Amino acid sequence: SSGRIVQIIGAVIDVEFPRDAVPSIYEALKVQGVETTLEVQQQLGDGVVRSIAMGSTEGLKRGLNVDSTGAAISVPVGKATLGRIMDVLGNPIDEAGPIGEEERWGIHR
Amino acid sequence: AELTTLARPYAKAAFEYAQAHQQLADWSAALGVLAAVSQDDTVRQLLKEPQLTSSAKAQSLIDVCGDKLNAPAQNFVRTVAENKRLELLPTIAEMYEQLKAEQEKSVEVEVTSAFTLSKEQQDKLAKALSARLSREVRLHASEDASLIGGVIIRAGDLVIDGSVRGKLAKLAEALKS
Amino acid sequence: SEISEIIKGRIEKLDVASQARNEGTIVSVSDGIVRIYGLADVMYGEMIEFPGGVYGMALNLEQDSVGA
User: Fold this and answer.
1) Which cysteines does the record link by disulfide bonds (chain A)?
2) Which residues pair with B42 in a beta bridge?
3) How many helices (H) and strands (E) does chain A have?
4) Cβ of A79 under 8 Å from any chain B Cβ?
């Protein structure tokens, strides 16, 4: 189930979720209608989680809906990554199109 | 912070609404019942559980009070619960009565005496206090064998001591010097 | 008092869940610190057992919660 943004101070964003659907530590969340990803850093209690944005906060507002992805930030791995330029989330930042990935791995281990 | 510093906005908001709608009596009963109910040992425990949401704490407290809360008083309990201040209810009721007492021009007075004082003497004391306080005084007489005679009056921070115990202390302080 | 028999009668129907003195519930999790509600009988320096075989130690016995 989805949560809602309740507070924004600098790069740190607080999101409130139903008490039976609170996301795990380091889980990746996606803001609806905006190209921004959040990584959960702490569970504050009362269904609230504190997170850091993986994109610019200029387009964010309080009350925006947030979706839990069920896993940590996952990036493409193996032979397909050679000769390519990528961002923190594993997206190609060169103009050579989508990466021919066959497997994805979580960044926390 | 002092509980009084946190309950002042809520007590003031409830008093202004109750005064503007002529509901001063109704809110004294609503706040009084919420204060009493919020302090019972099973409700005191339910209002501290980590799994209940603010809305469930408010709804539970509203269902227990039932008919002793009008629609405005229910909106007030939901506001106090959403702001996470349900522990202030006893202090909110206490501060609401202070605003109501000063609006009605009345004062509550505590009295302690060596022996039981008769109705004629209570009215004689009340008359004088009402004249200096320029308010309708309401005495609360009580017994204290510690005094050897006289009475001790207290109205807020004002304390008038006419007991012989106080006179014996003044005599001591004047001779010990 | 203000607690009428009706009010007293309604309070007895509340689903107030009893907490054993040796049990608690995790309230918040951050940077290796776990804050717990309950655990009324826990001693300073005692081991706490969590789900999945994880263990912690009680270091802050505060008035409203245990910091482990």
Assistant:
1) none
2) none
3) 0, 8
4) no
